Structures are given as C-alpha cells and as structure tokens.
Amino acid sequence: MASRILLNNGAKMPILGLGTWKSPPGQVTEAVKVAIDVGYRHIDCAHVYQNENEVGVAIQEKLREQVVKREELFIVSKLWCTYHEKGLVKGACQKTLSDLKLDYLDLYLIHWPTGFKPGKEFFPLDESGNVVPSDTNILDTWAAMEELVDEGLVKAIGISNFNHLQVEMILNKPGLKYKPAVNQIECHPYLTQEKLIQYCQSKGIVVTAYSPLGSPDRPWAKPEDPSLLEDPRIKAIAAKHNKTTAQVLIRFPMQRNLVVIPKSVTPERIAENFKVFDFELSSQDMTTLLSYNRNWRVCALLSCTSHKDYPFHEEF
Ligand SMILES: NC(=O)c1ccc[n+]([C@@H]2O[C@H](COP(=O)([O-])OP(=O)(O)OC[C@H]3O[C@@H](n4cnc5c(N)ncnc54)[C@H](OP(=O)(O)O)[C@@H]3O)[C@@H](O)[C@H]2O)c1
Ligand SMILES: O=C(O)COc1cc(Cl)ccc1C(=O)NCc1ccc(I)cc1F
C-alpha cells in the first residue's frame, strides 16, 4: 500500500502521522525529532494543544539539519473555536505558523464546527457551566478559511468533527470556492464510523482517524471504560500477524483508505507505530475489527452539548 493519499487539492498526504495532543511540552520536541528520524513526514498539531512552539523547534531543527526538506513534510494544524470570526481567522493561523516556524501549513482544519465567544479562555463558560457560543456559522468560517488558501498561508483546508449534515452544508455552500480536503474524526474499532466515512469518501473528502488507540491518556478516562489496547480479541489478531495490538489498530484505518495519527511521546512506541507498512490485515480481519463497534467516543464534552452546532446529536 502506498504511503500517501491524493487530496482534492492535488497534493499528497502521508497516511500515517504523529499526533501531539497531550504530548508534554518538555517531551514533544524530542518526540517529533525521533518521529522524523524514523520516517514520519506528517505531524498533527493544534493551537489549543498549547505545544506548537515546541513542535516547531523540532521541525525547524530537522529542516536546518537537512534531515528532510520542507516539501517532504505535511504539517497540519487547526483553528480553535474561539477564533471563528472573520477578523480573527488569519491571526489565529499566523500565530500557529509563527509557533511552528513555518511559512505555510499543508492543511488547516476547522477544529470543531462550533464557534465560541472570543477571548483568552479556550472554553468560555457561563456561570452554570455551559459554553458561551459565538453567532458565527460554519459557512462564514469556511469563507475565511478559503481566504487563507488565496493568501498562501495554507495549501489545503478542511474540517474536523463535522457530522454528515455539517459536511453537506459546507459542500452546498453558496459560492463554495474550495471543497474541504479532509474531515478529521474519531475512529477506531469501538467507533467505526461507517456511515460518515462512506459519505465523506463518496464526495472525495479524505478522512483522518483520530484517537486510533482509544486515547488511553485522555484526561477524562474512567477506570471502567472499554480499552482497545487491552481487548483480547484485538490482541489475538495482532498475535496471528506477529505484530503489536497498536500496530493492528494503526493498520486498520490505513486499509479503509483513511489517514491515521497515533500519538506517542515514547521513542520506542513512535518507532513501533511506524512499522505498519509491511503486513496486511485480511478482509475477514477487517470485518471482524469493524464488528467491535459500540458507538463509544473518546471525544465528547458535556459543557458544549447545547451549542447549536454541537456535532454529536445527529446519528452520523
Ligand atoms: N481533531 C480533534 O478533535 C482531535 C481529537 C482527538 C485527537 N486528535 C489528534 O489525534 C491524535 C491521536 O489521538 P489521541 O492522542 O487522542 O490518542 P491515541 O493516539 O489513540 O492514543 C495515545 C495514547 O496511546 C499511547 N500509545 C501510543 N502508542 C502506543 C503503543 N505502541 N503501545 C501502547 N500505547 C501506546 C500513548 O502513550 P505515550 O504517549 O505515553 O507513549 C498515549 O497514551 C491526537 O494526539 C491529536 O493529534 C484530534
Ligand atoms: O479537541 C481535541 O483535539 C482533543 O480534545 C481536547 C483537547 C484540548 Cl487541548 C482541550 C479539550 C479537548 C476536549 O475536551 N475535546 C472534546 C471536545 C471539545 C470541544 C467540543 I465543541 C466538543 C468536544 F467533544
């Protein structure tokens, strides 16, 4: 299987990338350096992760060392919810560019479909704990994203955590100039996303699977939640292939024509996670993994559920 997938902007995107949410700032520079040294060419970032400066130090060092050329890297970031307004989008993108020490992003995503009140706080709340919306909508935010392409700040634009109706709304936007290249969504054997993936793929939108290992380090994890890495059924498939459970969990979305972005700051795991191009899951393996779906989400948040554009009320 080829290492990159063709986007609807004409550029190629590496199907494996390194995730950076929760990567501590004192560890992520080494994580990204190691990743690039062992072959990663795609890094998934976001302003809200609070570690783009440190990710950028690694990228810049590897470019300066001539370990890789800029054209060989595929750097992704995301517009946070408190920057959905017309007059804030460019500055948000530029802050990310400055922190990453880049003059363009390969892909810039609307991180969530919901706009929040601008200000210092990433999750502005009212006194009862509900997020405070902005009156921005996904269509006007999209027009602002299109401007970034036309200004040379980003090579591609896309969306993240958009449900099928929200994707459809973007595709049906009056005067749409650039289609979204990517929809980045949670996807793993407990949340298989067949409906949303088929819709996006049918429209030429590439899907990126986040939390492919079930995000065991998510800060709201409960001791009782289901665990992909410990699931004996997945362990069995891994054993049959002489691979680790994580390697199976990474290969799974790859064979569905998805991009996948496992996170690690552990050098041995960063390397392990990249060794997924030399085996194949059978169709039966794939269908068996799909059968484990239970519609379980890592990524959901009660404080945001009443926002008009919160994505997870719809079935898909
Ligand atoms: N667009 C969005 O809204 C959104 C939401 C969630 C995630 N994402 C992106 O997707 C990325 C991945 O998702 P995620 O961070 O939620 O979780 P994940 O990649 O599913 O899991 C990360 C966890 O798995 C561990 N791990 C990694 N490789 C392992 C291995 N080979 N064996 C055992 N454990 C392993 C990591 O530990 P160590 O790091 O300690 O090694 C970490 O605790 C994020 O970092 C972010 O870039 C985007
Ligand atoms: O959103 C992400 O990329 C990962 O999740 C988070 C990352 C950070 Cl730095 C802070 C918070 C979250 C988090 O609560 N995500 C869940 C979530 C956020 C926003 C909305 I709108 C809905 C959600 F489910």
- Ligand 2 lined by 138 (C-beta under 6 Å): no
**CA distance readout (Å), 183 to 6, 113, 204:** 14, 11, 11
Domain boundaries, the chain: 1-316
CA distance 271 to 275: 7
The greatest distance separating any two alpha carbons of the chain, rounded to the nearest whole angstrom, comes to 54
> If you ran DSSP here, which 8-state letter would residue 307 be given?
S
Nearest-angstrom CA–CA distance, 207 and 257: 8
Of 119, 183, 212, 128, the residue nearest 311 (C-alpha): 183
| CA distances (Å), origin 8, targets 118, 176, 200, 245 | 32, 14, 12, 32
Q: How far is CA 48 from CA 23, 43, 76, 78, 160, in A?
A: 12, 15, 13, 8, 14
Structure tokens at 54: 């440190």
Query: In whole angstroms, what is the distance from residue 189 CA to residue 258 CA?
Result: 13
List all residues 6 or more positions away from 156 whose beta carbon is below 8 Å from its beta carbon. 7, 9, 11, 106, 107, 108, 149, 181, 182
CATH fold of 1-316 reads TIM Barrel (3.20.20)
Residue 162 to residue 185: CA distance in whole angstroms: 8
- Given a contact cutoff of 8 angstroms between Cβ atoms, the answer to whether 310 and 298 are in contact is no
Q: Please tell me if the CB atom of residue 80 comes closer than 6 angstroms to any atom of ligand 2.
A: no
Two structure tokens written together for 6: 């063709």
User: Position 145: which residue type?
Assistant: M
- Residue from 48, 210, 225, 251 to probe ligand 1 pocket by mutation (most atoms less than 8 Å from CB): 210
Q: Is the CB of residue 304 below 6 angstroms from any atom belonging to ligand 2?
A: yes
307-to-110, 209, 248 alpha-carbon distances in Å: 16, 24, 36
- What residue has token string 């109706």? 165
Reduce the DSSP state of residue 299 to 3 states and report it.
Answer: coil
First to last CA, the chain: 29
How many residues does the structure list for the chain? 316
User: 259: how many CB neighbours lie within 10 A of its CB?
Assistant: 26
CB 163 within 8 A of CB 229: no
Q: Which helix (DSSP H) or strand (DSSP E) does residue 195 occupy? A: helix 194-202
Ligand 2 mean position, distance from CA 48 (Å):
9
Task: Please check whether residue 106 is in contact with residue 73, taking contact to mean a CB–CB distance below 8 angstroms.
Answer: yes
Distance CA 124, CA 110 (A): 18
Question: Are 55 and 80 a contacting pair, CB within 8 Å?
Answer: no
Which method was used? X-ray
Task: Compute how many other C-beta atoms are within 10 angstroms of the C-beta atom of residue 143.
Answer: 14
Nearest to 188 by CA among 302, 100, 316, 298: 298
Residue of 78, 81, 109, 112 to mutate, ligand 2, most atoms within 8 A of C-beta: 112
Documented resolution in Å: 0.8
For ligand 1, which residues put their CB under 6 angstroms from it?
19-22, 44, 111, 160-161, 184, 210-218, 229, 244, 246, 261-266, 269, 272-273, 298-299
Q: What is the DSSP letter of 185?
A: E
CA atoms lying within 13 Å on the CB side of residue 11: 17
151 φψ region: left (φ > 0), alpha (ψ -120 to 50), beta (else): alpha
| Residue 61, burial from CB neighbour count under 10 angstroms (0-12, 13-18, 19+) | middle
Burial of 80-102, coded b for 16+ CB within 10 Å and e otherwise, reads bbbbbbeebbeebbeebbebbbb
Residues within the annotated binding site? 10-19, 111, 211-273
Q: Are 246 and 272 in contact (CB under 8 A)?
A: yes
CA-309 nearest atom, ligand 2: 21
The string of DSSP letters for 61-113 reads HHHHTTSS-GGG-EEEEEE-GGG-SHHHHHHHHHHHHHHHT-S-BSEEEESSS
Report the candidate in 7, 6, 16 with the shortest Cα–Cα distance to residue 277.
16
79 lines ligand 2 (CB under 6 A): no
Residue type, 165: L
190-195 contact pairs (CB < 8 A, 24+) = 190/214, 190/226, 190/228, 190/292, 190/293, 190/294, 190/295, 190/296, 191/293, 191/294, 191/295, 191/296, 191/297, 191/298, 192/290, 192/292, 192/293, 193/316, 194/290, 194/293, 195/164, 195/315, 195/316
Local structure of residue 122 (DSSP, 8 states): S
Q: Of 131, 139, 20, 12, which Cα lies nearest the Cα of 81?
A: 131
> If DSSP states are collapsed to H, E and C, what string results for 218-264?
CCCCCCCCCCHHHCHHHHHHHHHCCCCHHHHHHHHHHHCCCEECCEC
